[PDB]
Amino acid sequence: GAYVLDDSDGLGREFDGIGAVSGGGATSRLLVNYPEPYRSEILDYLFKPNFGASLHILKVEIGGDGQTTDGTEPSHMHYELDENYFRGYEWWLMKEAKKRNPDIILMGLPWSFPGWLGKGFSWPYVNLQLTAYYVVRWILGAKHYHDLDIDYIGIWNERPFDANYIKELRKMLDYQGLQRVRIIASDNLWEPISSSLLLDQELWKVVDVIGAHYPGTYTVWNAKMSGKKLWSSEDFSTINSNVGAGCWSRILNQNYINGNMTSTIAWNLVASYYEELPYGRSGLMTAQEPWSGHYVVASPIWVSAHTTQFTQPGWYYLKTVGHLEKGGSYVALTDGLGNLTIIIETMSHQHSMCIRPYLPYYNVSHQLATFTLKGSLREIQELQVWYTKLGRLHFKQLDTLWLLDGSGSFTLELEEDEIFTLTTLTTGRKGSYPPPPSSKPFPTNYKDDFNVEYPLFSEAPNFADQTGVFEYYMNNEDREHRFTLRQVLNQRPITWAADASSTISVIGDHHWTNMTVQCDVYIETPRSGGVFIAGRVNKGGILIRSATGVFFWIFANGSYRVTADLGGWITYASGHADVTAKRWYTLTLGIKGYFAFGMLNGTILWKNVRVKYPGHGWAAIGTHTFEFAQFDNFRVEAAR
Ligand SMILES: *[C@@H]1O[C@H](CO)[C@@H](O[C@@H]2O[C@H](CO)[C@@H](O)[C@H](O)[C@H]2NC(C)=O)[C@H](O)[C@H]1NC(C)=O
Ligand SMILES: *[C@@H]1O[C@H](CO)[C@@H](O[C@@H]2O[C@H](CO)[C@@H](O)[C@H](O)[C@H]2NC(C)=O)[C@H](O)[C@H]1NC(C)=O
Ligand SMILES: *[C@@H]1O[C@H](CO)[C@@H](O)[C@H](O)[C@H]1NC(C)=O
Ligand SMILES: OC[C@H]1NC[C@@H](O)[C@H]1O
Ligand SMILES: [Ca+2]
């Protein structure tokens, strides 16, 4: 009936912010080659204050060269003695975020590590000091090369932690003058990190935040006992339709109400990766067409705004938050300066299902809510009102509510799937740019000669690495092939996912059925080396080992194979070929209906080879194992 909002008996927990994840893996891959002004507009919708999502927190993957869900991300240390702080796009993303919002909170976390750290094993805790050294170098580089202060460092995403590692990382940070950097652990479940902190005083002193993944709005007793800040350091991960926006809306409120969590961070920031990769379109918005410029400002963007535009890190929750009598919830926050924000959600079960977990049915029906301000809140007599309805009307501002009659009280009629924000703040704004170009398929004719002398990014556009890492490469010794694309991993990473045994980068339109793919290739390893081109590649990311399609391989021992699968278990054709190492060859692969053919230097090597049909997928290039190889003058023609 009536809900008392008071602060006279004190406040609840400090609010730490709302944010999102870029990474785990290659989720921002397709954003970097958006043309202007669209790329800038997209970043504004995400990071610009008082405009769109206005995010408080940005969390990025610390690339380790392994596959980490929708691709691989490059590391700052590919090999021992290698350091480079200009690979990939997370540096760039963090800088764009800081330009728009200097107060944004930055976090780094590893998913995978380069193999050389394991010293023969695939384990990051063999040499604690070395792994900490690797991680701390990343934090230093962010400062020295991009003027970025990293606020939080994590351990190993959804993977076991090592208590001695966490202690060494703290020791190492301090040694490098990074006392300011805080540690969050362990980006997995509540246990065993929570009990470990109660049993080990030394561990407790070095962990600042307990971050848990997909907690279902609840926490556990040991985490409450620790007295640490508790965050949902990864949540959401749901398609950004209205139902994903509902999920996001409900948990933003109820993570604090049910679980004492004072921050929630969504995976992922923006869907800039091919939709047919795992968890397609699971970002706060969509930008998966840099060639057309088309992007979609999805419902979750405005759901966020209901909290982010009217709260800041350092505000406090009121003690008086809770559930509504007939479904839904409410939270309230102040800044200690006279401001008050009230956020109300009535998301129904049918329209707010998250993928993890799925909630047992709960009823939500029409109701009346009376709110009464007490304590310092009593003198408030004016409140701005923002409204959203999911089904649809987004972040529309309504008429001001006045509490002039001295009752410090007001009443709202609530229905299902609504959000209300009531605040004393006048700065709210539904940001708006003109509509972007219409959606268009990947170009049916496409070419890249990789001839860029000073590239803005370390990899050519639209190539999404799914195992291994491909980079622009300048070779001054060669005139015809001075500027190529090169696979630079020479050993299997300490993996997060099940990376393939072969490296591979995919590109184009997953709908493609008929295609001709051409590329110049160069095998660097004598006798044992091999490369391939392919089409109809149907799976990537987490499932990259599963990929079928048509694969045209050549090897430096003088042979070729044609396979249905990346793993090379199923043969379509095979034979001998005039192929050696350290020599440029032109491969062509044509696939039409039931049949395929392959050319070596413009001459037929095999043709009319039966392949599975119907079938569809991307084009791709790659190498037999983790080995150096170069690629040049890529072209693809295809019918969708
Ligand atoms: C964590 O939040 C929970 C809410 O889920 C708090 O537990 C109590 O909640 C009930 C109603 O759910 C209130 O009537 C109690 O007053 C709350 N407890 C106290 C001590 O006030 C709990 O307080 C929170 N825990 C911490 C450590 O902040
Ligand atoms: C609500 O918040 C605003 C913004 O934080 C407060 O306004 C600021 O007040 C400080 C001093 O208290 C000034 O230094 C800033 O320049 C002000 N900024 C703006 C944008 O006005 C305001 O005092 C808070 N309280 C109320 C009742 O509005
Ligand atoms: C939900 O609640 C309303 C009002 O109490 C009731 O009429 C309706 O039958 C309920 N539905 C379910 C599925 O419980
Ligand atoms: O829900 C899937 C997400 N969890 C970890 C992140 O990398 C994604 O795989
Ligand atoms: Ca070239």
From Swiss-Prot:
GO terms for cellular component: lysosome; membrane; mitochondrion. InterPro entries: Aldolase_TIM, GH59_C, GH59_cat, Glyco_hydro_59, Glyco_hydro_59_dom, Glycoside_hydrolase_SF. Substrate binds at T69, W111, N157, R356. Glycans are attached at N260, N339, N363, N514, N557, N601. Pfam families: Glyco_hydro_59 (PF02057), Glyco_hydro_59_C (PF21708), Glyco_hydro_59M (PF17387). It is an enzyme of class 3 (hydrolase). It comes from the Eukaryota. The active site is at E158 (proton donor/acceptor), E234 (nucleophile). Detected in brain and kidney. Its EC number is 3.2.1.46. It is linked to Defects in Galc are the cause of the 'twitcher' phenotype; an autosomal recessive leukodystrophy similar to the human disease (Krabbe disease). This deficiency results in the insufficient catabolism of several galactolipids that are important in the production of normal myelin. Belongs to the glycosyl hydrolase 59 family. This is Galactocerebrosidase. It comes from Mus musculus.
